[PDB]
């Protein structure tokens, strides 16, 4: 139902 | 409440996280951190497959090393040359292609100068 995404480096 | 680890500037710390192995959804594990008053920050992520990805935030490159032991279902983060700006709570999370997914407890780390 929900998620926190922490993106890898750009 | 305020309880955590305390390291002197220049010191080192190792974290570990259980990593059951690759599912259809996730192909690695890693860490992010959140310092007081700031947004969550990627730290590092590692693939279950040897040789696939090993990502590091620019702020920790050369100082932190992530590693896996698939035979123990574990991943490790070796944090060397710690500095005060590394003060934060550190959270483990499953990875998919390097990005971390937290689908809800961290390790609070204070580094002095």
Residue numbers in the entry:
A (entry chain B): 304 to 313
B (entry chain A): 8 to 111, 116 to 124
Paper lines:
G115 in Z70 or mutant 3 and E115 in mutant 1 were thus not modeled in the structures due to the high flexibility of this loop region. Mutant 1 with the introduction of a glutamic acid residue at position 115 had an improved kon and very little structural or conformational dynamics differences with Z70, which argue for a charge effect facilitating the interaction with the basic tau protein. In contrast, mutants 1 (G115E) and 3 (R47K) showed the best behaviors in the different assays conducted here and could be good candidates as intracellular antibodies for further testing in in vivo experiments as improved versions of Z70.
The activity of this promising parent VHH named Z70 relies on its binding within the central region of the tau protein. To rationalize the potential effect of the mutations on the interaction, and particularly the effect of the most abundant mutations in the screen, G115E and R47K, we have solved the structures of mutants 1 (G115E), 3 (R47K), and 20 (G115E + R47K) in complex with a tau peptide by X-ray crystallography.
